[PDB]
């Protein structure tokens, strides 16, 4: 199926506590493979997946330089942002960045991303056509004009459709026996009386990969959306993921409710009934 490479970086200013903290991580699909941390001693891009170890010293040299360079420019961008928003240098602020590309089954390019967020909200982003920018506000528009003048978009576009998809293609091959993997969820149901006339039905999905999944409750064959509780998908820590959906039901009416599970690793969607 399709695949993605993504880089996430977070810069956090610490007034009266030294330089801003910079943390970058790299993902192929739902598997992390590298990290960088400006507060760590190594001061290098570190491997966080087995299949990336097989990269030579050059790779680690190049990647380390790029991510270190980026930390310094986002460091400065935090300064520049204070100016644009007329904010004091006594407060702490955040600069987030996502970058990456998507490829189909045939390894062909599908989509590219280059996005920034200041204090948790959109700042500037490269549109889907990778030709123009989306400025979120008055401040980001200043940057947008700069990036237009400096032709940043054409540079990033080429990199996304080229270097990125080529890098993604290589990573997949190297992480073949691990990234082409598709683990179906093990499902089960729990049941607990909330009181003398009500019980909780909780639908479980465990040990699946990738993380993408859909858990749905129906009552008498009809989606029971509003009344449901649905937790965020969570990492088990072993490379697989977990999730559950719960409904509060009248005691003795358990059989009316059905849980429906959709996942890439499943031949057909599952149905669970207590």
């Amino acid at each position: 199926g399709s695949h993605s490479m993504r880089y996430f970086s977070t810069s956090v200013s610490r007034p009266g506590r030294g330089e801003p903290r910079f943390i970058a991580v790299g993902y192929v699909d739902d598997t992390q493979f590298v990290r960088f941390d400006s507060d760590a001693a190594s001061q290098r891009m570190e491997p966080r997946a087995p299949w990336i170890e097989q990269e030579g010293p050059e790779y680690w040299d190049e990647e380390t330089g790029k991510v270190k360079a980026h930390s310094q420019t986002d460091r400065e961008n935090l300064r520049i942002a204070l100016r644009y928003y007329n904010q004091s240098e006594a407060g702490s602020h955040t600069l987030q960045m996502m970058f990456g590309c998507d490829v189909g089954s045939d390894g062909r390019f599908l989509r590219g991303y280059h996005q920034y967020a200041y204090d948790g909200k959109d700042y500037i982003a490269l549109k889907e056509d990778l030709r123009s920018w989306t400025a979120a506000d008055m401040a980001a528009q200043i940057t947008k004009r700069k990036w237009e003048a400096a032709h940043v978009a054409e540079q990033q576009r080429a990199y996304l459709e080229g270097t990125c998809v080529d890098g993604l293609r290589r990573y997949l091959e190297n992480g073949k026996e691990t990234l082409q993997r598709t683990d179906p969820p093990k499902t089960h149901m729990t049941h607990h009386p909330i009181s003398d006339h009500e019980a909780t039905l909780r639908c479980w999905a465990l040990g699946f990969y990738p993380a993408e999944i859909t858990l749905t409750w129906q009552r008498d064959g009809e989606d029971q959306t509003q009344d449901t509780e649905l937790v965020e998908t969570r990492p088990a820590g072993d490379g697989t993921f977990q999730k559950w959906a719960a409904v509060v039901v009248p005691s003795g009416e358990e059989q009316r409710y059905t849980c429906h599970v959709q996942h890439e690793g499943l031949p057909k969607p599952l149905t669970l009934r207590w």
Binding site: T73, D74, E76, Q155
Partner: peptide, 10 residues
Amino acid sequence: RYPLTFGWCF
């Protein structure tokens, strides 16, 4: 491969 971020000046 980490992007080239030189021109990402705000």
